[PDB]
Symmetry: C3
Subunit: 213 residues, 3 copies
């Protein structure tokens, strides 16, 4: 993608699972990141759903070089600019709009936007993108929906997210159109609100092993 030195494809094929992270207390950012890395998970999506989000991204970026940190829930060019300055390596949006696609295209980091319909995918393809997030996965119609929607597009790859759990992420990873999935079970709130990092690491390891066929 001309202006992106790091391809969206490389972000999505780094591992089978990209954790959708919600960090409430900035102090838990780094240890949580190092914990995930300890469990074999290197691409971390920090969602812009909390006050400390961007700060969390900046911290992880400077302190956990063994992890590729990025931003999630990026809804517009303003937020894209913010996470880019904070050090995010990639951006994930739950959906897409032309202003976001355009600023991302002209930007320096890869954006992996979510889509729910073929028209949304085609719009994204008009901007040169080939990797997308399928969100909300289950609500969109699960594996069947993704299969139909991926049908007429052989070169497109997806990262299904939304309703994905240890019980069904294998069903998605099995699809040839899928590169990886997104899950929020790796960094449970309760576990993060207790400093139980050993628990996080184990969830990552299980997530990675549970993905290997």
């Amino acid at each position: 993608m001309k202006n992106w030195k790091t391809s969206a494809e490389s972000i999505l094929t780094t591992g089978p699972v990209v954790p959708v992270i919600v960090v409430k207390k900035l102090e838990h950012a780094v240890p949580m990141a190092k914990a995930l890395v300890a469990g074999g998970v290197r691409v971390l999506e920090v969602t812009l759903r909390t006050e400390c989000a961007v700060d969390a991204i900046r911290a992880i970026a400077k302190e956990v070089p063994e992890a590729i940190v990025g931003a999630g829930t990026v809804l517009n060019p303003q937020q894209l600019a913010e996470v880019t300055e904070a050090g995010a390596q990639f951006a994930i949006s739950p959906g897409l709009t032309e202003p976001l696609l355009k600023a991302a295209t002209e930007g320096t980091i890869p954006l992996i936007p979510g889509i729910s319909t073929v028209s949304e995918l085609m719009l994204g393809m008009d901007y040169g993108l080939k990797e997308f997030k399928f969100f909300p996965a289950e609500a969109n119609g699960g594996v069947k929906a993704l299969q139909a929607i991926a049908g007429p597009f052989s070169q497109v790859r997806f990262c299904p997210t939304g309703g994905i759990s240890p019980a069904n992420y294998r069903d998605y990873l099995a699809l040839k159109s899928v590169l990886c999935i997104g899950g929020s079970w790796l960094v449970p709130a309760d576990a993060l609100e207790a400093g139980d990092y050993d628990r996080i690491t184990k969830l990552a390891r299980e997530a990675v092993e549970g993905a290997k066929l």
Copy 2:
């Protein structure tokens, strides 16, 4: 929003139910509006699906000032201008497009447009909107679908419509992201056609009563 004296939020917080009205005979418009008001329902969405629709809005605005009358099935700038001229206090659309959104934001009355996906939600948000219609609610996957779609957006509120009835409207009204719902059961075509306003008033009163949470 800057140019709207009456906020979209105000429209949706007025009551738990917004009747989606289809009036075929102009002469029924006023007594219908009075009957609904009598039942405790005053946010009246007159859909642009019949020739007398615009005249209906005008008649109601004039003869039943106590009701907050507006337009539905507004598909483009032209129609939006036409109903605004006719006295509609708000506008509802089953979906959205940039031309409609831009014209609405430039206009004087709130537009509460329908979306089905996150990308459509984001487009509306690009124009500053925060209140939306979720249509067709049931066909889009119902409550589950909406919760998934509303997940990444805490400040957004909805008015789901499409397949909602006394049987399930409390399922929607129970959600934190839902302010109210739209339904067509308060004004059955036969009742309206038969000038049976007692029935309409009863339906409205039962609707308001059953929505209590």
Copy 3:
């Protein structure tokens, strides 16, 4: 549209079933085509999902004059221009984009674009289209979705495709808003390579006979 001698309506109203074709081997096109027509199916959608696609359209348009040959999976003004020159009589897309919609109205052949949501349908209507593909049918919310849409748009007509087979195509065909159905069951891959045109004619024949309501 102003520049379509053969309306989209004409295409969709020709027969009850429109086979979505994927031709891997040129030279399989004509025999397959003739096989379909012999069964009573004249409208053939050749999807741009293979290298020989464009060649198959030209080959079928030359050796089978009665068949109404068209292109499928047309995604951008480039593929549209290509198929048009190759002799496609119409174009079908999985979804729609403004660039594609614009080039279509400027072109010479009718475009029947797919839509999944009311917002996408409205975009298409902003370009004057009245006929649309409903894809992916099942995932979109199947029959009930379509009916929900008929409310605000009673003049729009659809050709639903995706998850439709003899077990359910009648459920769609029964709807007033439906002109015809799209399906792939008329030409089973195995049957093609096996050179079993008889099977194709029987499937096509049963398709038409089964549609009679």
